[PDB]
Design a protein around this ligand. Structure first.
Ligand SMILES: CC(=O)N[C@H]1[C@H](O[C@H]2[C@@H](O)[C@@H](CO)O[C@@H](O[C@H]3[C@H](O)[C@@H](O)[C@H](O)O[C@@H]3CO)[C@@H]2O)O[C@H](CO)[C@@H](O[C@@H]2O[C@@H](C)[C@@H](O)[C@@H](O)[C@@H]2O)[C@@H]1O[C@@H]1O[C@H](CO)[C@H](O)[C@H](O[C@H]2O[C@H](CO)[C@H](O)[C@H](O)[C@H]2O)[C@H]1O[C@@H]1O[C@@H](C)[C@@H](O)[C@@H](O)[C@@H]1O
Lengths: 114, 417
């Protein structure tokens, strides 16, 4: 009943990152899991998802640049970002699908020319 | 205290209030509810609602496929012991056979003993209807007026055997050999014509038997109706509570003998899955009764006022909340049975038996063979997988439903004053 994201920070366009989410077993186990982001001036947007058996699917805005993955032994979700652009700037969040009631703190990702 | 020091902390609220004042954003939200409603009640493969209905129904069927071969049944039409009565139901999953034989004589039908033939008739009819429909494919949830035709046979031999007597069906006193009767029957409030026909057969070297054919014409195949049939199947098993005993290197049945209602954890899950799907199918009428396709705006061509132009909002909220409920219940159905979250004997029953198929190669759904017994043969694993796949592909629609629920909730608040 707990969601903890990490791995974010400030990077340069074209650069790259790896986010981790630590989930409790009651949320994670036997459930579709996914990643979300909330960019300035907007509402939370769905980004990617992955079934217990490991099959991924992605939103059009990130397809071919982000990879989602899970480790069912350790209750961990991961998101691997490549070829980053400023438009990818946002608070990134994890949850199961359909969503548990309460969200974690998220992890800030910022992409800026310099 | 005051709105600024509040929006300092919760900036996604500032954005929500901005959308709630903008018709273009409200109408975009309504287009979305239109679309996600269609995913949910107009589609099949990609609808979580559909996969959850299908799972609930397949679990019921699968449970009998696993255990029927081992279930005592017998006696006569009055529910009493028989001396010499063999009653055979066709297209059922018996020991190395596509028929189940009920020929337990002398012992009295009832609890912790043989299932009476009256109960087995109730059980069989529901089974034939469910397997027939599974075979032709279940319709989308919005299609609730369809019908199918269902036909099944059973036989009676032995002296004393009253289970195929013509008075049971309203056929003349004579007329066991050739007689027939056509008669409307009532199923989930709809009108079905049913023809019941009798013939006697006298083979060359072996005993005479009566054969009964039931032809049901215009059976409803809507989700609501098929959930009622699944419920009849599993409730008849559980109420009659008959005795069973198994023929066990490979999977291990726990308990191996006893009474069928003693699989309490399995029958309670099945019944909860059905209950949850029934309530999921009932959101369909709430969605249809609160269509969102009329566009909204101000009036007398004035700019939109969120505090007076938004009487559409109670409908928008009801529609959005219903969709979110269909999604959560579909997920609940799958979690009730997914082996990843089960333990003990229950987990073993599911991975060992219910989620397997011993039929020969995976033949189409609804198909009984001589090797069906002691395995589920109801595509339980593939249906779990597809529920999960449909849910993953509903990522965006779930977020849009929540945004439209939040927008409509905001407008409803504004309009109380
Ligand atoms: C008891 C029975 O089945 N009698 C029918 C009789 O069966 C024997 C023959 O098939 C014979 C052929 O050689 O073999 C016998 O079995 C042998 C094997 O050959 C052998 O290999 C093996 O090792 O051992 C067994 C036995 O130990 C069969 O038992 O055949 C008759 C002729 O075909 C048949 O009568 C015909 O059909 C009936 C409906 C009637 O109109 C006759 O005129 C017609 O020729 C016998 O059927 C029974 O006949 C009596 C009349 O004498 C009754 O009419 C009876 O129906 C009433 O009573 C029964 C009680 O048994 C019910 O309670 C019912 O309410 C009454 O209306 C009728 O038995 C019923 O119908 C048959 C087809 C079957 O389904 C029974 O289960 C029914 O109860």
């Amino acid at each position: 009943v707990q969601l903890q994201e990490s791995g974010g920070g400030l990077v340069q366009p074209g650069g790259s990152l790896r986010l981790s989410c630590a989930a409790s077993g009651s949320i994670f186990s036997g459930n579709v899991m996914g990643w979300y982001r909330q960019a300035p001036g907007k509402l939370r947007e769905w980004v990617a998802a992955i079934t217990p058996q490991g099959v991924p699917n992605y939103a059009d805005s990130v397809k071919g640049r982000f990879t989602i993955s899970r480790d069912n032994a350790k209750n961990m979700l991961y998101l691997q970002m490549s070829s980053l652009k400023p438009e990818d700037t946002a608070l990134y969040y994890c949850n199961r699908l359909p969503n548990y009631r309460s969200w974690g703190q998220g992890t800030q990702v910022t992409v800026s020319s310099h | 205290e005051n709105l600024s020091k509040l929006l300092t902390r919760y900036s996604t609220l500032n954005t929500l209030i901005k959308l709630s004042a903008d018709p273009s954003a409200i109408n975009a939200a309504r287009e979305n509810l239109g679309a996600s409603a269609k995913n949910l009640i107009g589609d099949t493969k990609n609808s979580p609602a559909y996969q959850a209905v299908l799972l609930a129904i397949n679990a019921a069927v699968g449970f009998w496929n696993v255990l029927g071969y081992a279930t005592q049944c017998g006696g006569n039409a009055n529910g009493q012991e028989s001396t010499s009565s063999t009653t055979i139901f066709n297209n059922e999953p018996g020991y190395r056979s596509t028929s189940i034989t009920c020929s337990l004589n002398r012992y009295k039908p009832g609890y912790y003993g043989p299932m009476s033939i009256e109960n087995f008739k109730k059980l069989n009819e529901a089974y034939q209807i469910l397997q027939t429909a599974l075979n032709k494919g279940l319709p989308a949830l919005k299609e609730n007026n369809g019908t199918i035709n269902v036909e099944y046979t059973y036989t009676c031999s032995g002296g004393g055997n009253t289970n195929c007597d013509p008075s049971l069906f309203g056929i003349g006193g004579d007329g066991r050999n050739g007689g027939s009767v056509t008669k409307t029957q009532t199923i989930d409030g709809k009108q079905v014509n049913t023809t019941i026909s009798s013939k006697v057969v006298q083979p060359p070297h072996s005993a005479a038997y009566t054969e009964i054919t039931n032809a049901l014409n215009g059976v409803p195949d809507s989700a609501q109706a098929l959930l009622a049939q699944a419920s009849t199947l599993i409730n008849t098993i559980n109420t009659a509570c008959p005795y069973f005993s198994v023929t066990n290197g490979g999977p291990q049945m726990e308990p191996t003998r006893g009474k069928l209602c003693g699989f309490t954890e399995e029958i309670s899950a099945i019944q909860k899955m059905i209950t949850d799907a029934q309530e999921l199918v009932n959101q369909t009428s709430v969605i249809n009764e609160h269509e969102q396709s009329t566009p909204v705006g101000g009036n007398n061509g004035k700019p939109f006022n969120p505090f007076t132009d938004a009487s559409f909002a109670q409908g928008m909220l009801a529609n959005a909340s219903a969709q979110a409920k269909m999604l959560n219940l579909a997920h609940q159905v799958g979690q009730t049975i997914n082996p990843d979250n089960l333990t003990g004997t229950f987990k073993n029953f599911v991975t060992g038996f219910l989620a397997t198929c011993n039929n020969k190669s995976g033949s189409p759904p609804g198909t009984v063979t001589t090797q069906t017994f002691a395995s589920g043969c109801a595509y339980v694993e593939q249906t779990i997988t597809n529920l999960n796949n449909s849910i993953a592909h509903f990522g965006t629609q779930e977020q849009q439903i929540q945004q439209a629920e939040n927008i409509a909730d905001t407008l409803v608040n504004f309009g109380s004053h």
